[PDB]
Amino acid sequence: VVRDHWIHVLVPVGFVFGYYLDRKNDEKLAAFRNKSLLYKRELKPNEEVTWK
């Protein structure tokens, strides 16, 4: 289905790439994970994360 016509696959994969790289930037800018004075609970239940 891909190599039949490969032109229509271009910009949705481009958008998926851009979305992936925005998530990568958000993981890069992950300072103040629980250092805000307002959004600060103790970490729970399992493993180390509250947003990613």
Partner 1 sequence: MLKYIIPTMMLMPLTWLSKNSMIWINTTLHSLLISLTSLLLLNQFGDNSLNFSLTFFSDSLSTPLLILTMWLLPLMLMASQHHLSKENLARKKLFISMLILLQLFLIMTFTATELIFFYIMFEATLVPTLIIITRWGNQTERLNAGLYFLFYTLAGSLPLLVALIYIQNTMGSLNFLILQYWVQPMPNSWSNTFMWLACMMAFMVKMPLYGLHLWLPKAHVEAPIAGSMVLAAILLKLGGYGMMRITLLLNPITDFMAYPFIMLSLWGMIMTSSICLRQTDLKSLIAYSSVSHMALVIVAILIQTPWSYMGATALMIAHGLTSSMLFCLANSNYERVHSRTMILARGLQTLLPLMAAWWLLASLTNLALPPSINLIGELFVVMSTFSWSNITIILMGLNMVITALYSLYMLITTQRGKHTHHINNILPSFTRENALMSLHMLPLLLLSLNPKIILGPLY
Partner 2 sequence: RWIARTFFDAPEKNYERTMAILQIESEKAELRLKELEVRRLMRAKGDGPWFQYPTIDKALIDHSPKATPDN
Binding stretches for partner 1 (CB under 8 A): 7-8, 10-12, 14-15, 17-19, 21-22, 25
- Given the structure tokens 């509250």, which residue do they identify? 50
End-to-end CA distance of the chain: 34
Give 17 or 22: the residue with its C-beta nearer to partner 2: 22
CB 43 within 8 A of CB 34: yes
Footprint on residues 6-45 left by partner 2 (CB under 8 A): 26, 29-33, 35-36, 38-39
Give 9 or 43: the residue with its C-beta nearer to partner 1: 9
